[PDB]
Structure formats: C-alpha cells, structure tokens
C-alpha cells in the first residue's frame, strides 16, 4: 500500500487561472476571498496548482 506523501498547502493560495486554451472543463479552486472552494472553467492547458477535479478534493486539500 502506498504511503502518504507530503502535500503543499500553499497550492491553495493562487488565483484561479483558466489558461490560454479553449476547452470547457469544470474544475474547482480555493477562492482566497470567499474562503470557499468554487467551480471554474478550465481551458485544458497551463494554469496553476489551485485546480482540483472535484469539489470534495478541493475541500480536503484546502479547507
């Protein structure tokens, strides 16, 4: 079984970044103003580490 690896909680602090590409992909980020995990549309490329596939993953990581 796979041991837990150390996580970088500063990854929750970036602004949401849709990136430059034009796909329509639902992702989640921790919003440092509202202090809540929120949905945003990701274009499929680039961005930053404040990008989670599901709300619960964002909540587990960031709240």
């Amino acid at each position, epitope marked *: 079984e*796979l*041991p837990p*690896l*150390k*996580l*970088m909680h*500063s*990854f929750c602090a970036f602004k949401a970044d849709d*990136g*430059p*590409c034009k*796909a329509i*992909m639902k*992702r989640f980020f921790f919003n440092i103003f509202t202090r809540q995990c929120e949905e945003f549309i990701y274009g*499929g*490329c*680039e*961005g*930053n*580490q404040n*990008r*989670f*596939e*599901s709300l619960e*993953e964002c909540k587990k*990581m960031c709240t």
Partner: antibody, heavy 121, light 107 residues
Framework: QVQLKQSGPGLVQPSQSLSITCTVS????????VHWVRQSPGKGLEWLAV???????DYNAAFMSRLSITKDNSKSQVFFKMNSLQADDTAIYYC???????????????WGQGTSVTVSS | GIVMTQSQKFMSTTVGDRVSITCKAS??????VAWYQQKPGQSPKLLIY???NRYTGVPDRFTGSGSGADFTLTISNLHSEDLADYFC????????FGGGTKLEIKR
C-alpha cells in the same frame, strides 16, 4: 507493488497515428492520475498530458489538438493516441503514475517501461 | 512554459565525494520541483519532490534544496550505483524537465 506495462506497436508511418495501452497494477485509476511523457535525444523529456481519476484531461498546448486519452478503470487500462506523427515525434513514450493522488503540482513516481516509437516510411 | 536549465551536461566525479547538481528555472516556481535519476535503457526514477522531500526508500545521502528559481540536488557520498543521468522538473503551469546532468567517473 506498483507496475505500469505498456503495449502497442512503435513503428508509425508518416502522418499516421500512435496507439499505446498502459496497464497498471498495484494502484487504481480511480485514485490516481496517469501522465504521458516522451523522451528524445533532440527534445529531451517532454510532458504531453495527464488523465485524472474522474477522466478529466490536462494537455500540453502544443499537442492538444492531436491527442486522445481514454481509460477503462475496471481493466486498469489507459489508452494513449496521438495523430499525424512526423519524423520529429520519434521518441520513447512513457506512461507514469502521479505521485500525489489526484493533485496537480508534484511528480511522477512510477513509470512504464517505455515504447520506442519510430516515425518512418 | 517554464524552462528548466541544467548548466552542466556532464560532471566528472569520484566515488566517495560530494556532488552537487544545479538547476535554474526561467522564473520562480516556488517549491514545486522534483528530481529524477535515469540510467541507459531504463525509465526515470523519482528521488525528490517539492524541492526537498526524499521519495520513499531513496538513500538519505540524497538532499534537495532550493526555492524560487535555483535548485540543487546533492549526493553527500557518491556511490558507484549513483552514476546516472539526473533531471530536474517543475510542475506549476505544467510539467517541464531540465536537459539532464550525466555523472561520469574521473580517471
């Protein structure tokens, strides 16, 4: 014990498609993303894309329009396809497990054995 | 994308010595840097993640250091089995890799 075993033919004629199957064991595709990276003498290691546990994909913008990544969780299989290969796509292609579950921003801890791809007529 | 530069393509080393491999990012990447080891014919192996964390089972003679744009992998006591290629990697906007540093034996 984690393993990623690649299968699929590596000889590709000009502008044809490359298809590789990555069959994983020791972990679930329901819990981990799987990356695709290639390595060539000319361009070194180049990351291409990752398929996350719920099927969402992040792409390298330079390859996005000719990449198709799918998977079958039940069979522990990820399917990589790249269209219209050119001579400069000759490289070793790897699948690799995301180190940190379903999270962006870390590393790739277990790698497939690689597929040597030759683009030539 | 971010460019990771390893200025030393080749380093000549001696068993038992300390060896330091440098990597510079074209702009700040914070701590999101990993190091890999690779030998001919084989796939990369992960040594270090998040700049300074040893991966599972990696010998404790490997240390990663650095933040921002400058990163260093140090082997405190080079073993023969450490002769290999070493690559840095950042994962901010997307993963990119350094060009590699190959250790060789001085003779």
């Amino acid at each position: 014990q984690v393993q990623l075993k690649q299968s699929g033919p590596g000889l590709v004629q000009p502008s044809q498609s490359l298809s590789i199957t990555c069959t994983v064991s020791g972990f679930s595709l329901t819990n981990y993303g799987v990356h695709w990276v290639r390595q060539s003498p000319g361009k070194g290691l180049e990351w291409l894309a990752v398929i996350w546990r719920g099927g969402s994909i992040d792409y390298n913008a330079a390859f996005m329009s000719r990449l198709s990544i799918t998977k079958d969780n039940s069979k522990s299989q990820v399917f990589f396809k790249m269209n219209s290969l050119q001579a400069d796509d000759t490289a070793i292609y790897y699948c690799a497990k995301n180190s940190h579950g379903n999270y962006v921003g870390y590393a790739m801890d277990y790698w497939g054995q690689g597929t040597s791809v030759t683009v030539s007529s | 994308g971010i460019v990771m530069t390893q200025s030393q393509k080749f380093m000549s080393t001696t068993v038992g010595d300390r060896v330091s491999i440098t990597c510079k990012a074209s702009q700040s990447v914070g701590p999101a840097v990993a190091w890999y080891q690779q030998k001919p014919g084989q796939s990369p192996k992960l040594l270090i993640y998040s700049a300074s964390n040893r991966y599972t089972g990696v010998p404790d003679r490997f240390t990663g250091s650095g933040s921002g744009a400058d990163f260093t992998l140090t082997i405190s006591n080079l073993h023969s089995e450490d002769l290999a290629d070493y690559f840095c990697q950042q994962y901010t906007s997307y993963p990119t890799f350094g060009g590699g540093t190959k250790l060789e034996i001085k003779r």
